[PDB]
Nucleic acid binder design. Sequence first.
RNA 1: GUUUGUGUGUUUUACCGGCUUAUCUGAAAAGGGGCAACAGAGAACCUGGGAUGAUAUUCCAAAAAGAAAUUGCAUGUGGG
RNA 2: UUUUCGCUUCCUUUUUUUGGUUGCGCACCUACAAAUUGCCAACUCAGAACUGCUUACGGCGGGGAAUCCAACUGUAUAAUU
RNA 3: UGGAAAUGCGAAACACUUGCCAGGUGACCCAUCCAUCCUCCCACGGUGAGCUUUCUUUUCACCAUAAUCCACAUCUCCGGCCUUGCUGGGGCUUGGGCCUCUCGA
RNA 4: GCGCACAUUCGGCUCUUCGUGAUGUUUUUUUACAUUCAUUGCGACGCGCGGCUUCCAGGAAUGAAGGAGGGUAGUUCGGGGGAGAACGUACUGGUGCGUCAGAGGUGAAAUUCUUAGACCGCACCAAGACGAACUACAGCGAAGGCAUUCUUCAAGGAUA
Lengths: 96, 132, 91, 57, 185
Amino acid sequence: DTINTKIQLVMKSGKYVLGTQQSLKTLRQGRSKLVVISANCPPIRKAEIEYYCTLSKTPIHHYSGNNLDLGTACGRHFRACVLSITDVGDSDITSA
Amino acid sequence: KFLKPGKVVIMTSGRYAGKKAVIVQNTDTRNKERPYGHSLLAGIKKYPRKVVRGMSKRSITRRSQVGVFLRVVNHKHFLPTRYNMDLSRELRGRINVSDASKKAKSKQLVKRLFQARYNAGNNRWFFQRLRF
Amino acid sequence: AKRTVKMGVMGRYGARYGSNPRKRAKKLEVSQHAKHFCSFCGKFAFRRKAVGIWRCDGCSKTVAGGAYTLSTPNNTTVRSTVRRLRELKQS
Amino acid sequence: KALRHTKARLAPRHQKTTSRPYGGVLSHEQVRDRIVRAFLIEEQRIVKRALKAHAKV
Amino acid sequence: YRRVKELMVAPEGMFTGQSMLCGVKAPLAIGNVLPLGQITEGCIVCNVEAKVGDRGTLARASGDYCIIISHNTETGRTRLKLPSGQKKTVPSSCRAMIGIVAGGGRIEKPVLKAGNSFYRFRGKRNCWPKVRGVARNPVEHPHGGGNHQHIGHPSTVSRHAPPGQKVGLIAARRTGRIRGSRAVR
RNA sequence: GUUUGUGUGUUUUACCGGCUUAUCUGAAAAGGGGCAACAGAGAACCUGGGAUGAUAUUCCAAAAAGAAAUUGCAUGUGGG
RNA sequence: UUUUCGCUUCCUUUUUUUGGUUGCGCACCUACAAAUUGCCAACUCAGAACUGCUUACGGCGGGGAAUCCAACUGUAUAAUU
RNA sequence: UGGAAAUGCGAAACACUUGCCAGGUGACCCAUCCAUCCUCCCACGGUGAGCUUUCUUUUCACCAUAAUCCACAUCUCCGGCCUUGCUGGGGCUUGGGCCUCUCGA
RNA sequence: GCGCACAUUCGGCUCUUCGUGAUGUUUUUUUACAUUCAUUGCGACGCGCGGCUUCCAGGAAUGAAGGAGGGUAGUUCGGGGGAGAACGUACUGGUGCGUCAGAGGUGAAAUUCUUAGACCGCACCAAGACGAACUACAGCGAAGGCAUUCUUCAAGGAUA
């Protein structure tokens, strides 16, 4: 759960971006504190993102699961790969 | 964030198919003046032609090139590299105005410059094809 | 506008060609045509062409995985089997 | 340009000229892709070598 | 570019053209090609050879795969189990591509109509509809005539039987309802 | 005289670029032979004609038939 | 109107940052009726009257109730079936 | 050889080679309606012919080929000098850019 | 009980200023010597005060929790279930020998097997099965039903 719950919390308080493009931007801008990935990756993106996330020294989390789950969890309802948590605060365990 | 001059990046589109560029100057943001964040880049269009052997009479100095160009370029359009060819000697004081002629002028120098780093220097890497 | 009480597609054959068959058949109509999950792209859109020839609409990926429905249990199982065994084989 | 087979003999190259390599036959996105894909992987390949290179010494 | 191709015979669903690097210096992806012997017992392979240098004679039909049931490491023979109640012992030598037919038989499906049967058989020489022996003109056939619908003599023949004298139910050790089981009890 | 600019010499040579004698290197299989389509695949003309007795997207030439299209190959000049 | 709409002036903080302030713009019919009306337009079906008298051109599936038989569609003895 | 880009050009010259080009380059069923082109009829006008006696708006006819450009004006700037630039259809495709749709739409 | 003489009462722990700039004093001392100490600066917390200044606010505003209900949270318990794997071991069938005048079954035998060779013994295999006594007015499970292991998975209860 943690990752989910922490994050669940993260959406709720936090700022995050879902949306790949966005993610990237976010990452770029640094405004992603953390990037989290689903297992549902078109791998390249994993890597791509990885370079960035790493570039940004951003957490990669492989949140180990799935498109839907990912959506569901973020309080959304469409097939989801990836998120970058820009800022949450209070989900500090996400910042852990 | 982590994009700064000298840093190498590879260009995608627009006459720069997978081509290598250095950040010269970042434009961290869109304005109306560029509705998109866009960095300013110095970059090379033209890789050189081969060193080997004894290669020709005079000799093949013909082949010995590097055609730069400078371009402002969507943030959305390069793959940045960890590498870096610092814009130190280069630019930190000697900026490139743009403009126009100034874009041209600097580029000329830059050609040479690039050739300096090139002329035997490090990161040979930088100045070449990736075999796609 | 009306959609029959119990046979779906079978309306085409009317009474012809018997109930038990209609049974047999009904089963496969449901399996084969259905839209079914994509792997990576994860939605269901893997549709049969030919004879169980399945490209994903929407990630444009084609999976060979046969017959009327794509990847049998056995295959999957197998897939685990290999998972395991190969895994063990390394492990 | 898009035509058909008898036409091309005719068909001008400068009308048959917007471009990037391997993609005089292409429009952006696929090409972007194929660049990208090499590039990264070939970093990780190098990285992989490099990983192993410290372990040795 | 410049590579080596990578498409042929169809087993399960990778999506095509793929970089399988082979022989035992294959890793063991499904479809990957490793020698069967050096594929571990109980593994499920598909298209194993037999001749060796045949690229899959056995299980060259839709659905299966076959299971290695034995290694004889002394000889380097292996006993593999043909899908059929039948073992074949081949050298453990043999190439094989990991896995199963992506395919898995349409055999299950209920076929339904003639038309279907028509499209069905077609890739080869024509062979169906099928009439029966009992009317097929006596002059060419064994089972014509009789002043009505029947069998003459036993359909159970010595295998050796002349052509024209050999059709049907060759030397059936038993026939009709399988009131029992074949092979081991 | 300089330096520079311009023009010229069958100058000379070095160097390119070309081109041919010329010399060496230098390709592998359902394809080591060749046919097989009067509808597939399928490479350049349109309309008009006080136009034939009976033919024509073929006959009408320069001007009022015209206007086309393509090939081949020249030629000079042009781009050079 | 404790936020990343933007800028100007001004004030405040060091600030020619912010923040407040001002002018204007940015998001927000909160401009909003009805859409009145203008125009042109269609033959379908329908409706109703009026009316009167005609198996009338044409073209137009018999039906029912059972028994035997073959599931069906398909197939065919050129030139009896 | 142009424009972040989608994407550019009198010529940005560059031919063999590619276990080269899932390169509609040949290349492909039917299938669906639908959409509309094409053509086509109707009919309005309007012409011209022809018709037409107790009655009428009757009849017919009324056209444009391949082959090629796409530069007119808006706007530039309505023409001093018109010089940025040459901006400028419809209506199907896709893409590209900005913004980033999430109370879900 | 309350206040009380001193923190030099048991006692707090920086409420024996704190932190840091640092300097100084220290100099076989708890080195250097921040706070204390001496020098002094800024910040300063504690604690106090001071200035307030500005803004802003509930107590109980919203009974009372069933030996009512519902959850929740904590070890855990059980042959609960469900996916796994591993096996023990037998029944066989089989093999592989060994041998051998009999086997075998039975109320009575009879049908069975027989010297290719029955049984038989042992080795071993194959196969499919089954979890044996353990293990019991004993557990778990809505009920049906539920007993190697581990591996799991998700579940349940009770108790707190």
